[PDB]
Structures are given as C-alpha cells and as structure tokens.
Design an enzyme around this catalytic site. Sequence first.
Site, PDB file in Angstrom:
ATOM      1  N   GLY A  88     -73.339 -24.205 -14.023  1.00 13.04           N
ATOM      2  CA  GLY A  88     -74.787 -24.300 -13.965  1.00 13.04           C
ATOM      3  C   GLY A  88     -75.467 -22.959 -13.736  1.00 13.04           C
ATOM      4  O   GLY A  88     -76.652 -22.895 -13.403  1.00 13.04           O
TER       5      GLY A  88
ATOM      6  N   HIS B 218     -73.307 -34.226  -9.765  1.00 16.79           N
ATOM      7  CA  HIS B 218     -74.378 -33.247  -9.588  1.00 16.79           C
ATOM      8  C   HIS B 218     -75.423 -33.824  -8.619  1.00 16.79           C
ATOM      9  O   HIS B 218     -75.409 -33.515  -7.428  1.00 16.79           O
ATOM     10  CB  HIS B 218     -74.964 -32.886 -10.951  1.00 16.79           C
ATOM     11  CG  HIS B 218     -76.061 -31.876 -10.894  1.00 16.79           C
ATOM     12  ND1 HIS B 218     -76.755 -31.473 -12.014  1.00 16.79           N
ATOM     13  CD2 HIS B 218     -76.593 -31.190  -9.854  1.00 16.79           C
ATOM     14  CE1 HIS B 218     -77.664 -30.580 -11.666  1.00 16.79           C
ATOM     15  NE2 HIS B 218     -77.587 -30.392 -10.361  1.00 16.79           N
TER      16      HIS B 218
ATOM     17  N   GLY C 257     -68.653   3.510 -17.495  1.00 17.94           N
ATOM     18  CA  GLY C 257     -68.998   4.360 -16.375  1.00 17.94           C
ATOM     19  C   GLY C 257     -67.973   5.460 -16.291  1.00 17.94           C
ATOM     20  O   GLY C 257     -66.997   5.466 -17.054  1.00 17.94           O
ATOM     21  N   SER C 258     -68.187   6.391 -15.365  1.00 17.70           N
ATOM     22  CA  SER C 258     -67.322   7.563 -15.256  1.00 17.70           C
ATOM     23  C   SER C 258     -65.886   7.233 -14.810  1.00 17.70           C
ATOM     24  O   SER C 258     -64.945   7.929 -15.204  1.00 17.70           O
ATOM     25  CB  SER C 258     -67.959   8.607 -14.328  1.00 17.70           C
ATOM     26  OG  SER C 258     -68.177   8.069 -13.038  1.00 17.70           O
TER      27      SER C 258
ATOM     28  N   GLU D 127     -64.315   4.842 -15.863  1.00 15.38           N
ATOM     29  CA  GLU D 127     -63.734   4.188 -17.024  1.00 15.38           C
ATOM     30  C   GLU D 127     -63.503   5.127 -18.221  1.00 15.38           C
ATOM     31  O   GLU D 127     -62.779   4.769 -19.166  1.00 15.38           O
ATOM     32  CB  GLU D 127     -64.611   2.999 -17.440  1.00 15.38           C
ATOM     33  CG  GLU D 127     -64.718   1.884 -16.383  1.00 15.38           C
ATOM     34  CD  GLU D 127     -65.527   2.282 -15.149  1.00 15.38           C
ATOM     35  OE1 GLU D 127     -66.505   3.063 -15.290  1.00 15.38           O
ATOM     36  OE2 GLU D 127     -65.183   1.819 -14.030  1.00 15.38           O
TER      37      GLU D 127
ATOM     38  N   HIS E 100     -67.629  -1.222 -14.736  1.00  8.89           N
ATOM     39  CA  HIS E 100     -67.696  -0.048 -13.869  1.00  8.89           C
ATOM     40  C   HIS E 100     -67.694  -0.343 -12.364  1.00  8.89           C
ATOM     41  O   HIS E 100     -68.690  -0.842 -11.798  1.00  8.89           O
ATOM     42  CB  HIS E 100     -68.944   0.771 -14.194  1.00  8.89           C
ATOM     43  CG  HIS E 100     -69.151   1.904 -13.253  1.00  8.89           C
ATOM     44  ND1 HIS E 100     -68.286   2.974 -13.188  1.00  8.89           N
ATOM     45  CD2 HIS E 100     -70.091   2.115 -12.303  1.00  8.89           C
ATOM     46  CE1 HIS E 100     -68.696   3.807 -12.248  1.00  8.89           C
ATOM     47  NE2 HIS E 100     -69.786   3.309 -11.696  1.00  8.89           N
TER      48      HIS E 100
ATOM     49  N   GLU F 119     -73.915  -6.048 -17.020  1.00 10.07           N
ATOM     50  CA  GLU F 119     -72.573  -6.617 -16.936  1.00 10.07           C
ATOM     51  C   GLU F 119     -72.547  -8.136 -17.035  1.00 10.07           C
ATOM     52  O   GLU F 119     -71.556  -8.707 -17.495  1.00 10.07           O
ATOM     53  CB  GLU F 119     -71.886  -6.128 -15.670  1.00 10.07           C
ATOM     54  CG  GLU F 119     -71.495  -4.673 -15.732  1.00 10.07           C
ATOM     55  CD  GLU F 119     -72.620  -3.709 -15.364  1.00 10.07           C
ATOM     56  OE1 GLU F 119     -73.737  -4.154 -15.039  1.00 10.07           O
ATOM     57  OE2 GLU F 119     -72.333  -2.490 -15.389  1.00 10.07           O
TER      58      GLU F 119
END
Lengths: 524, 524, 524
Positions: free
Chosen positions: C400, C280, C24-25, C27, C69, C46
Amino acid sequence: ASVHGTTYELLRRQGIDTVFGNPGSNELPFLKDFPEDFRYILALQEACVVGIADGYAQASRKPAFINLHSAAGTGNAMGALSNAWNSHSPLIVTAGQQTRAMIGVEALLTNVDAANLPRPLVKWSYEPASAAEVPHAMSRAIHMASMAPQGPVYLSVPYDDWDKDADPQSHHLFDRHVSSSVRLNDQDLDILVKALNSASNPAIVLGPDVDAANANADCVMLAERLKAPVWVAPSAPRCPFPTRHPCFRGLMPAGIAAISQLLEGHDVVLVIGAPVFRYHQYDPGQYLKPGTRLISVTCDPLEAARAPMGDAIVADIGAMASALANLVEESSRQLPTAAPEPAKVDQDAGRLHPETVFDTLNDMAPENAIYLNESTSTTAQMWQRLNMRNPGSYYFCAAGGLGFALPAAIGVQLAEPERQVIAVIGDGSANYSISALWTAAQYNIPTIFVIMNNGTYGILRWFAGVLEAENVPGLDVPGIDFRALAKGYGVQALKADNLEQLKGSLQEALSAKGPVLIEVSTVS
Amino acid sequence: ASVHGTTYELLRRQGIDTVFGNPGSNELPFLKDFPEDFRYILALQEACVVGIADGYAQASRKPAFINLHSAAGTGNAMGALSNAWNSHSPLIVTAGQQTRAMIGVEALLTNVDAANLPRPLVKWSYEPASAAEVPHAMSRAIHMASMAPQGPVYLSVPYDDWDKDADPQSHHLFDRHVSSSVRLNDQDLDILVKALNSASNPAIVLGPDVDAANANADCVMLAERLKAPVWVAPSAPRCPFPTRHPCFRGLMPAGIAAISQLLEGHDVVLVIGAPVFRYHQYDPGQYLKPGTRLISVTCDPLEAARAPMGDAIVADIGAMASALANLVEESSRQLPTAAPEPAKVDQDAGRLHPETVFDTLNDMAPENAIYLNESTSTTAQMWQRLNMRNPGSYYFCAAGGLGFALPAAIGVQLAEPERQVIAVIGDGSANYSISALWTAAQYNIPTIFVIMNNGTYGILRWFAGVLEAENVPGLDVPGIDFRALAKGYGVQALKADNLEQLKGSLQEALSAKGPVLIEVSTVS
Amino acid sequence: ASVHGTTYELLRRQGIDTVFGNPGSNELPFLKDFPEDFRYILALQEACVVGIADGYAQASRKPAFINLHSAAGTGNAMGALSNAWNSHSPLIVTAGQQTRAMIGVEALLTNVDAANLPRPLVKWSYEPASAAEVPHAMSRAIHMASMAPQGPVYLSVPYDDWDKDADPQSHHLFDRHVSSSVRLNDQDLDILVKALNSASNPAIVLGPDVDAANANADCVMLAERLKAPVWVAPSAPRCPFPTRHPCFRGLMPAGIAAISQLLEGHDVVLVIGAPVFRYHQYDPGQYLKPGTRLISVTCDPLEAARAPMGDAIVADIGAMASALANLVEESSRQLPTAAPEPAKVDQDAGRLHPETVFDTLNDMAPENAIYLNESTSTTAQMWQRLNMRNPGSYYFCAAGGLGFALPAAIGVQLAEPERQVIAVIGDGSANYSISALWTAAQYNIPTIFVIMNNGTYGILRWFAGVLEAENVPGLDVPGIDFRALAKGYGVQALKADNLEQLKGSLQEALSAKGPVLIEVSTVS
Ligand SMILES: Cc1ncc(Cn2c(C)c(CCOP(=O)(O)OP(=O)(O)O)sc2=O)c(N)n1
Ligand SMILES: Cc1ncc(Cn2c(C)c(CCOP(=O)(O)OP(=O)(O)O)sc2=O)c(N)n1
Ligand SMILES: Cc1ncc(Cn2c(C)c(CCOP(=O)(O)OP(=O)(O)O)sc2=O)c(N)n1
Ligand SMILES: [Mg+2]
Ligand SMILES: [Mg+2]
Ligand SMILES: [Mg+2]
Ligand SMILES: [Mg+2]
C-alpha cells in the site's frame, strides 16, 4: 477461555507436553495451574535449560518448548542458542516480560527491546501487541520452529496477558498442519538422477540434517546403489550413517584444501543435509579440483546461498533422500571396501590415552548407545573408534560452543529412555554447564558422563603450538575435583586412573540405576 | 608496528592492565606474547568472566577489559551484560572472530552479524572493516564505556587482524583524554540551589551512580545541610549512603504507591544518581502525591527521558553532588526522627532465620566489610540489619539477573584486597555461576561466600502465594551439597546448622587466608 | 582478475545485464569501465530507481540489479522496499560505502551500521569483511533474492574494494545453479488431491505469487477441472486469473467477516500463492464459518506461520500448481456461470466517473495491455471493468506504499516492449515519485500515464467519514498542473475534462511512439 487456557490447549494439540525451564516472577502467571498432562523439567541455569531442551528436540525429532526469565534468563542461554542455530534445532523459547503497565518505566525485570535480544540466533523473534494475540503468536512460534529449515524462535510475553480473555476464534489455531515435506519437481529430479547414474566415480557427503530427518537408511540405500564412498561433512553435529558400513570413509577434515584433495578424482559429489562446508582451520586452496562437480541438497536457503561452489537444491532432506534412494539405478561397479579397524595404541599402566578410552567404550557399551562429544582434542579418534550402527547415536556442539554435551546428554536420555547415553566431555568443557548434573539426579535420568581430565584446554594448547604463539595465558585448568562436583549435585561418582579402573568403573556405571560421572585421568 | 603491539600500547596508555577472559582459538593471536605488565584473570564460563570483571570495575571505579570467544562465549555472557547495563558498568568486551577469509563461508566459530549479538545490552557494538582500524575501534570502545553514562561495549575482531600492520597515525590514540565531568550551568544551578534552600520539607533519594562516582560523602554533607531524610532508590544495585547516619531512612520498596506514600508531605524531592524509579512489584497508584515536586539529577539521558514525573538534569553525579553540597545553605531544621531498631527475631537452636544471620554478620564483620546480596527473599532485612558506613560496601544484581554476586564478589575482592568481601547468596542463586569459585581458589582471592540454604526459590514461593497461584512447578531445589561444590573447585568449606555453628564458622572464615564458603541451614 | 572484473563476470554469468541506478562517489569505482554488454538505467530519485527495477523484476520474472548511493540513497528507497518485500520481488540492492580506511572516523558518505539500515524489509543484508569476499557476497545476494520466497536483498560495498585482487577460486561462483522448484512429496500430495476430489463445493483463492510464477494457466485448468469458483486474495498486488473467465468471482474484500461470509458453504477452500489473508479494514468476525476447511499453498514460511486458520504447504507455486492441475479428477459438477458485465454509470457532460474511465480504457486498450493501479478509491471498480485475459496484466503496490505505480510502469514497459502499459494513478499518488517521468522520456519507454484528478486524497476523506472523524487536516491536494509536470520532465501531455476529450486523448496516446501523460478530471 483465558489466554492461559487457550495457549496450553494449543500446545497440547500441537503435540507439546513438556516445558524445560528456569522460573521467574514474570513467568509465574504462565506456570500457575500447570496442567497435569504437562511435565516441567527444571534446570538450575539457563544454558542448561536450553542445552537439555536441545538434546531432547534433536533426539525426539520434534520441537521442544522452553520457558525462561526475561532478559537475564534469555541472556544466560544465548551461547546455547548459538549451537541450536547451527544444528537447526526446533526450539520454542518463551520468556516472561513485565506487566504491560510497567514496561514504559523500565521497571526491574523489563526486557527492553526484547525481540532484538536473541538476534541473530533465532529464525523469528516477537513480542505481541496485545494479550489476545498471544495464542496466535505462540502458533507462529511453533510453526516457525518446525518448518524447514528448523531452528530456534523467541516469544516474549508480558505476564499480565495470561489471565486475560482469549479470542474465541483462536480455536482455529489448534489443529493447523503445516508441511515443508517437499522435493524437487519430477523433470529436474530426473535430470539429477541421470547425472548420478552417469557418474563414473561418485562420492557422497552427508551432514546433520540427514540424521535429523532420519534419512540415514535411505542414504545407505543410495550409497549402495551408486557404489559410492560416504563421508560425513566437517565439524559434524550428528552422525548420519553407520560408521562400519563398507561405504563409510569417516569425518572430513575441516579444511578447504584438505577437502578438495579428498574429493579429487570424484566426478560428481552429492552433498546431502550439510552446509558446503563448515570449515574450521585455515587451510587455503581450491574449493574443488577440476574434474569435480558438486551438487548440494540442503533444507536451508542460507546454506545454498553461501556455498562457494556447486549447484544446490533447497528441499526437505527426508523427502529428497527417499526419492533419490529409490530412483537411482544399481551400479555394476564394485561396492567399496570397509575401512580397516583402527590400530590399538600402546597403553602402559598409567594415565589413559583417549584412543584407549574409546576402544573400551566401544567394547563395553550397548550397540544402541548414544554418544555426545565435548572433548575437543579427541574428536578424530572418537569418530574412528566408536561403531555407531543406528541413527541418533552422536551429538557434538554445532557451533563449537562448549557447555552443550553435558546438558544435551540429559535431554537425549530423557528422549530415549531405552538407549544408554554416554557423554564424553573434557575437563575444561565440563564446567560451562556443570549444574545440569542436578537435573539428571532429580528426574532420575541415568546418563553417564565420562570426564576426560588432562588438566588443560588441550585443543588450545595444541593450536598455540601450531601458531608458534608463545606466552599465551589461560590455557590450563588444574585443581578441579569432578567427583566432588558430582556429589554436590547428587550424582554417583567414580574415578579411573588407569585402564583396569576404567573397565571397572564403566562396568559399574552401566549397571547403576541412576546417573553416573566417571572422572578419567587422561594423558596431557 | 603490528595491530597487536599498537593495541596493547593503547590499552596500557589508557590505564588498562588486567584482562578477564576465557580463551578460544579466535583469541589466541591476541593473547600471544602477552605483555609482562598485564595480568590475565581466567574464569571457567563466560558469565563468570563478565561477573568478575563487573565487580572489579564497580569497586575500582575504572573500566575493566574482557576477552571472550566468538559468538558462543559472548552469548554465555549476555545475562551478565544485562546486569552491567543496569549498573552502568564500564566494561570493554572484546570477542574473537574468524579470519576474514573464512567469514563469508560461515566457517565454524564465525560470529555472524556480530555487532547485533549483544544488542540491546551494550552502548556501542562494532566490528572493524579492516585490520588497521582495530586500534581506533579499540579506542572508541574504551571511551564509549568510560563516558557518562558508563556501560558495557562490544568489539569483535577477526583473528588475522592482530599480526597486520597498524596505521602509524594510530599513535595519536594513545594519550587521548575524554571528559564528561560536567555540571549544570551557573544560572540554572543557582535556581536549583534556591529551590532547595526554599524548601520547607525536602527529601533526598540516592541511587547507584552516587556510589559509582564516590559522591557518598558529598551527599552526606548535602543531607546534613538540608536536614533532609535520605532514601535509597528501589532495587538498589549499590549503597550510596551510610546506613546508620541520622538522615538515613532505608531502602524504598519498589512500588509506585509505596513510594508516593513515603514521599507524601515533602515539597521538594531531590533524586540523585538513580532512575525514577526502578519499580518492580505491581503496586499501582500515584507517582507522586499532590504538593510534591521532584527534581532528578542523572548521568543517563535514557533515565531522564523515561521518568514519568519531575524535572531532570543530565550531568555527572560527582560534579553535581560536590557543587550542591557546597552551595546549599545550612538549615536550622531538626534532623529526621531516629529510626527504630530492627527487632531480634525469635530463634531456637535449629535452622537459622535470615534475620539472625544478618544480625550475627553485623556483630562480627569488620566495619569496612563489603557485602554482596543475591539472597532475593531477604533483601529488606539485610538493608535494615547491616551497618554499612563506608562507600563501596554493597552490590546487588542491577537487572535482577542471578549469577552476579558469586563472581562479582571475587572481582570486588580483587579490587579491594584490604576490605573483606562477604557474599550472601541464596542456594538457588548460587548455582548460576558456581564455577566462579575456581577463580577465587586459583588466584587465592579471599572472598567469603555465605550460602543461605533453605532448599527453595524462596521469593518465588512467596510471590506464588500472593498471586494465589496454585500448582506452580519448579520452585524447589533440594539435594545440593555446597560444601562438596566448594571442594570441587578447591575452596575451603564450612557448615552452619545453628547459631553456635554460625558464630564459629564466621570466626574461622574471618581468620582464613583464602576464600571460604559457609553453607548455612536457613528456615523455609 | 580484479574484484570489479570478477563481479561483472558473475553478474553476466547469472543472467544480469541491466543496472538500475542513481550514482554517487562511493559508486563510481564500480560503475567505471561499465561493460558493453550491460545497460544502465538512470532515475533521478532512489524511490524511482527501485520502483522501476521492481516493475522490471515482477514483469520479467527474474532478478533486477540496483545500485544506490550509501545511506542517503538507500534511505530514500526504503518505502519502495516496503512494497517489494510484500510482493516478493527479487531485487538485488547494492550500495556504495566509504573506503575502508575512512569508515572508522565516519567520514561523510559513510553508511553506519549499514546492514541494519534496510532491515526489516530485506531477506538478507550484508557488508563484506574484505574486498576478496565481495564476489562471494554478491553470489549470496543473487541467490537469496532468487530463492523462494523471493525478495529484496542488500549488499554494502566499500568503494576501494573494486580495484583489489579477487580470489581466483571465485570462478566457482559463476555457474552455480540454485533451485527451490519443489513440491509436496507424492504421499502427501495424493492425500491433498483426494481431499480436493472428494470436496462437494470447493472454492479457490489465488494470490500474487501465482502470477509471479506464471502459474495462471495451470490455475485455470485446476479451476475448470474442479468446476470451482475463483477469487483473488484481498489487497491483490497482481492478477492471477483471467477476469472474464466463467469461474472468476473477483477481488475479495479485505475484511475478516466479509471473507468468511463469502466462503460460507464452501467445504474446502484452496488458497494458492497468497497470504491468509492480507486483510485491511477492521471487520471483526469469524475467520471461517463452521463447515469450511482451508488449505493454503504458499512459497513463504512467514505466511504459513501467521495464517490464523487452515493447513499449509510451503512449496514453489509453479511446481505445485502444475502438479495439482494435472492430478485432480475432472469433476462432474456444473461449471460456474460467468459474472454479469457491470452496469453502465450515468455520465453527464462534465467531469468523468472512474467507472466511465475504466469502461473506456477497456474499449480502447489492446487486449494484452498491462495496467497499474495507484488510484486507491477506485480499485473495486477497476477490477470489475477491466478485462485482463493474460498473465502479468496488473500491478498494485503490495504494501500500500504510494509512489510505486508511476516508476514501476516504466520498469514493466521496459520488460515488455510489445505490451502497452497503462498506469492509472490518482492525483495524490502521482506526486510521490513524479520525477520517474524523466526516465520514460530519456530512454523513450512508451508508458501511458493516466492521472485521475479529483483534487483530494479521496480514499482518506471517505475513510474519514466511516470513522465519523471531523477536523482532520491534510486531505486535500488542490493546485497541481500535471501537464506542466510532464512538460517539465519531457513527456507529451494531454488533458481530458470530459468523455469526448477522454476518448480523443486515449486515441492519440495509444498511437504515440513515446511516453504520454493524460490528466483526467474526475468526480470527487
Ligand atoms: C563457550 C565457549 N567458550 C570458549 C570456547 C573456546 N574453546 C576452549 C576453551 C576449548 C578447550 C576445551 O577443553 P577440554 O578440556 O574440554 O577439551 P580438550 O582438553 O580435549 O581440548 S575448545 C574451544 O573452542 C568455546 N568453544 N566455547
Ligand atoms: C538468571 C535468572 N534466572 C531466574 C531468575 C528468576 N528468579 C529466581 C529463580 C529467584 C529465586 C532465587 O532463589 P534463592 O534461593 O537464591 O533466594 P531466595 O530463596 O531467598 O528467594 S529470584 C528470581 O528473580 C532471575 N532473576 N535471574
Ligand atoms: C507512502 C505513502 N504515504 C501515505 C500513504 C497514505 N495514503 C494516502 C495519503 C492515500 C490517498 C491517495 O490519493 P490518490 O489521489 O492517489 O487516490 P484517491 O484520490 O483515489 O484516494 S491512500 C493512502 O494509503 C500511503 N499509503 N503511502
Ligand atoms: Mg582438557
Ligand atoms: Mg541481540
Ligand atoms: Mg533459597
Ligand atoms: Mg485523488
């Protein structure tokens, strides 16, 4: 059994038998039916509650348990928690919450978003999702506080939880043993030992976690073997070494340039149980001179991560100090020569120089005295003039947060009833937690408080001078009668306007049965 | 211009001329060259600093500006912030941070994760990403504190920012005016007015935001027009209505069942400037009895969202009260039945009953006295026995956090120099912020402090009883000499062991030219 | 040197040579002048960037560096971070922030309160207070991620910082070595060894940190010496033991009652590198049955604290496994007998049973294949039917969180060029991170993706039953053509509607030189 019953059984089985607190209605269902094998220590404000517990935990080298009232009580203690964080103090802070049925409406005394309140000053912070989870959450709190790196934890408990039925399977919590007593693996430890043996001019720097681990004796042996001078890391919260041992070089100045200069010429510098480093003043320069390599042993990943230089090993300070002390070779180099005895400052018949006070304390106090420092303009002189041969002999607010020494001195004295505690506290610092005096009086805890009264925030007036900053308000604190404050809370009080009166007052304080406050008139 | 110069210009242009503080080294660069048009109010501990500022803000009905020291100082004030949050007090809390160059190494006095520290007790919390942003961030703080719902905010500033260059475009900040003086649109306001006019048996409940807005007189008109009984919402932080006005019914007990009972038969209950409701004790039952509809006018979306019953309107209390008062029709219904008179309680020539104290205060105090209450077991009797006919006449810790009334009474007295402040404080509550007395002495702020000494945390001893809770520790606080504490901090002290002495002490206190503390021996 | 230059030097000196990103800008100033010795791996969303980096870090056993970003990019990755937290994956997540001058006005692309965004799923989260601090903060990030317990960290950097002058003293960061390779002190380790030697019927339970540490072989030696059965802890994210070794007893069911039943009759249970336990399903009962004592070795204090039973030791899994393996005596007990091979399921000419797919994969796949599992309803069958001899052979989303296996399989394949990766993914799970396919195509990373298509959220429909819950919407996912999706992102695609086609397709896929996706029609 009830949550109440199960929780007190967990506490006693994990070695906790003392509650430091200031009560409230959300805490009464916890405090009811208080077990006879437990003791409750009341203080009148929460900064004092936590300060006392903190001193107790640091001196005893075990966790201390605290019970505070909801958000307001927790909030009143958050300055005390800043110090506890920096000293790695194992404090289990519990606070009462409203009954679960009245949390949603935010009734009075509801601790809103409770777990977030003490952040970022705690290692773990929690409110259980049900009454039957409370003992398990308390177990988590105990172990989180106790594991390296030790530190404060927070647990919020709705008051209606205590009477509810506990899960029978909570019995598995009672005797859990959790160990962090770890050290570097053999192969890499050997590599370290070889680097130490190969050093031509090693130096050692020790921090508070050495004293916390009672690693002091092992560090003495390590320093003797390596024939190495020993500093204490800057902004020292504790004393990790005998201050008249021949290797001892004293307290490092808390400056980047000053420390790299001090270490110049030392090829290997071994830091144990300190951050690298707790600098204070702006003193820009090199972190290390070339030719110096630094190796840090720390119990705290956060410390290892943020050191701007050197290698680091994250491990238990006790286990590491012991291993190194017993593994390194005996160097043939000459043992360092003891530092010279500080010079006697000229003292007229008037107000006392702080150098005079410390020399006199050193002359008169028992050899196993414990000192606390919250006289911020005189720290350097204190470190130079008090001979502290034994572990656990010195405490100073680890985050620079005032209001620590007065209550902490009471907790220390409770932890060490056979060692005379002497807190040296400035007239400014004295007020932050003044009401802690009452606890000393009430529980017959015979701490001595030496108030260094110069009428000002000394260290601030000095630093303003350095900054050439003019027209700064709020630096003077005239008009406080500390003997009257002591009387207010039931503590015997004395005054020392000169050296002769200082000798007499100290003599009287040392012989007195209860706590004593001495107001000393010191130079501005 | 410097960030320092620009920031002080922003502060003066936005009406701020007083800084309440306890200084530290991270704050010296801010406090240097302190402008001649500002005044600094020093207190000795941060709970006291914030408490004084809070009282001052509440009484003056304008924001108060505070300067604290890094994390420890902020932490010491977090109990005080819990009250400020509940009272919607517009407090701008600034704290000094380490120099940007030393934040990463976590040098002593670094406020780690600074913006998270005071959460969740602030509306906004922030540390600027550059020095040039500081004046903008200060602007945001001022407005976030000041906009409805008002509340405390927090700004952390690295000490090296002050001497840096400000953005020249920061001048646009200086004269910004931000308004939240809003009311319900005409169409929907007319619907509300019709509902009120159509009600057969309306009741009104008022909370602290009415007194904050100085909406008291408009509420009196509204109540007179509707011929409606008026309650004060429970756990009342302020007094929104004249307590001997024929409509006034008293303080609601802080219980769900209690309040629905009180409201039974009322077809429309209009609540203004209160949470619905600040309950306290467990008193389960109905929120409202059938046949009652509730409408709440609140300045706080959080209040509107959490009410468990009724409609709500989120708007400015001053604007809404004014509009309603002038739009409703004049009812021909009979006023509420006259309330009974509080009985004169039996009283011998010994220790004083709280009721005796309040009756004597009410006889002797000026009509425009301002009372603060931190005598937790006696609140109900206090509301019944004091005729408070003017706005801004009562303050009580809004989150139940002790340590408020003593310093706040000094702030109030500073804000209202022509109204005598009288703080009625329990012996337990008095210790939390005892050092505040010093500020009253130093600045000669003539608050009268009435200490109700019964030797115990009375309300806890009572609740212990109702819980049938046995063996509860820490409820007694014997052995405190409040005359000595007052002397310690330079405040004149008197004692009242019986009614004759009480009358004499109050006579003397009211004639005094400075602060006075009266220790009153009350019954158990 | 610039902050940009200094930071890349720090990265290479600390062993990083790969950047996983979606740009991104904020970055671009970091990514500009991208150094020749680094490679950039792009992914299209991402969750995919982080999943790929996660796979890579886990298989390479070293930290992975990520560049995202601002808030939106970081936010898109937070589910992936959920998994990375639970798998102790050492991920350095960096995100670009607006230029410091525009942060205050909250310009578009400003990451507000940036450090709070990824909490609570990161070990450390930070935004530096100045540009010169950036390299030191990156140093902190690298080490926080890499120290035990490993885990993700987050660093936000204003895009204007990169071009600024670095602190020359930053060079001290480049070669820092930080070790947490520690184990229990000799005295306490001897006690533990004695307890193991004295055990009459010990069992061992292994978790993911064993595989992360490559302590597998040492655990085999330990198991063979003690002649003990070996389970894998429930909800297993990795495979810590050869699954056809005679001691191997398979994956523990994730229930309290089921596990205490499994451990009945075992007097000592040693758990290594696992939480105790990642339960779980709701399956209430005893944590342990009478007669069983549990000892846990864990790299994570948070795990040691929350275990509801047993003793714990917090240390490095590698160091502890090696020491135990080499210290324990060779027991005379008989070696456990290997679990029998699972039965063959009846397979008609139609859709395939998952059992048949696994049987067939086991027959055709190379012995050093690496599997990933995100076929939730077939996990048990997968553990039973796949013979995994080597370390690093299995990955399953540790929290999970679906969307892990597809991108992670690409990261693993990148890390292990000579081991065939085969991801077995359900038709439901396949969609979460479908765009990750593009990265495999673009960099020619030869992962094989096996899609188990039953047209439903199988595990949820099952659970819906046991719950007796009807009228539950959203459980069916008809109408997805996975071959078309593959074609969309440039990956060769094959179908398998029966066993003959399955064999043919697998045969082609293994022989292929790029990524391949196989859509398998499986039974409901
Ligand atoms: C809770 C808190 N508040 C304020 C400060 C700031 N501060 C202040 C106000 C100091 C002066 C202490 O004065 P003293 O009289 O106790 O000692 P000296 O006179 O020897 O400086 S030192 C210092 O750091 C602090 N550190 N902690
Ligand atoms: C900061 C703080 N700490 C503790 C409490 C708990 N608490 C305590 C300890 C009370 C007793 C106050 O005693 P007092 O003497 O001031 O008044 P009474 O004796 O009339 O109760 S009332 C109360 O809520 C609190 N509310 N706030
Ligand atoms: C990100 C995310 N979303 C939703 C879920 C909930 N979930 C869901 C929606 C599952 C069904 C997976 O279906 P599948 O086709 O991938 O595998 P089966 O058909 O074998 O169940 S399993 C499961 O835990 C989750 N775990 N993670
Ligand atoms: Mg002083
Ligand atoms: Mg907080
Ligand atoms: Mg009382
Ligand atoms: Mg499916």
